[PDB]
Amino acid sequence: HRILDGIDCTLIDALLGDPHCDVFQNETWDLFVERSKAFSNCYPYDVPDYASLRS
């Protein structure tokens, strides 16, 4: 399986255009690993039904 390492970004941070995930441009994977030390250093956002868009 193609494992992707979300060190500095989550899945939603790569979809919105956070500047800390510039290396994930047009990157495909099989399983996204979200770290517990992930944070946002940009304009803050809110996702209503957070499990709806991430799935």
Binding site: L16, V33, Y45, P48
Partner: protein, 110 residues
């Protein structure tokens, strides 16, 4: 705007609704003081009203943005009309069908 779908795969667009902290931020960024974001298709219709309110101090700023998505089928046309607090998408994603998922973990990769 009009976004036709003449391809053979599903499209996924990401649009946002801006939420200013007060009435001064709305008039400084937009002309109309009361906007409305409406994103609808031939089979669905979703309207999100912008909510002016104070936010806690997150990363220095006191404003946030709500995120709502709209899946466009092949053969549908995406029409996005709004009068304020509209965030425009710059593209889309291909809704591929596979056995992929997500997993929260803290283990290193070997």
């Amino acid at each position: 705007v009009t976004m036709p779908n003449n391809d053979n795969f599903d499209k996924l667009y990401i649009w946002g609704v801006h939420h200013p902290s007060t009435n001064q931020e709305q008039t400084s960024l937009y002309v109309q003081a009361s906007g409305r974001v409406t994103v609808s298709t031939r089979r669905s219709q979703q309207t999100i009203i912008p909510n002016i309110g104070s936010r806690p101090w997150v990363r220095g700023l006191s404003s946030r943005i709500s995120i709502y998505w709209t899946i466009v089928k092949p053969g549908d046309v995406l029409v996005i009309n709004s009068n304020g607090n509209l965030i425009a998408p710059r593209g889309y994603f291909k809704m591929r069908t596979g056995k992929s998922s997500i997993m929260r973990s803290d283990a290193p990769i070997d």
